[PDB]
Each structure stands twice: as C-alpha cells, then as structure tokens.
Predict the structure of Type IV major pilin protein PilA.
Amino acid sequence: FTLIELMIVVAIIGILAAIAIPQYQNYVARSEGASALATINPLKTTVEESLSRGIAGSKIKIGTTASTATET
Amino acid sequence: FTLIELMIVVAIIGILAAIAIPQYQNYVARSEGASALATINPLKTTVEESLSRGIAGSKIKIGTTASTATET
C-alpha cells in the first residue's frame, strides 16, 4: 500500500459524499389525501340508496353488523 | 438511485394499499328481482284477454308456435 491510493480513495469518498437530496414530503401529503377521498366517496351511493328506497335517516350507520329491511 | 426515493415509493405503495371496499351484493340481488317481475308481469294482460274473449284455460301456453282461433 502507498499514500497515492489512500489519498485518491479519501478524495473519491468526499466526492461521492456530495449528492443532493430534494424534498419528499408533499408527495406523501398528497397521496394521503388522494386515498382518503377515494375511500370515503363511495358511501354516497349507499346514502342515496337508503334515502330513496324508503327507510329514514339516523338508522344509517357504519360497521359490520349485517343488514335487514329497516336499518342499513 | 438512492434509498430515500425507494423508501418513499415503498411507503406510498403501502399507503395506497389501504382503500376500503364496501358491500356490493344487495345491489345485484335487488336488480335481479326488479327485472324478474318486470319481465313476468305483462303476461297478465294476455291471460285476462284469453279468459275474457271466449277460449277456456289450459290451452294457454308459452313459447313461439304461432296462434289460431282456439289456442293462445
């Protein structure tokens, strides 16, 4: 081993240790909103169906408790 | 390529892989019944016509075998 190789390696290390990094927060901030609406939009179909069929409001809830001929 | 971009992509993939899916069986179950009755209701007109014209029952059948002055 010599000093030339070691110095060249040290210089190349510092050279590589200079890559810039741009922002990456707005991407996730927008992806979260693009998914929230896509997930909570389809409920309007069920709401309109329940309001136009015959049953009144209030009884319309969320979860997984089966269904019947009165509550949705 | 760096690790920041890859990790952000992996995180956005998992974020997108979270959209909920509501039920979609009652819609078809109701559409089938809404079509069955709509298809098999009009036969009452022909039944009443055949019973009020003069010909008796029994001879009233279904299919596509033409018609005459006795059978419907």
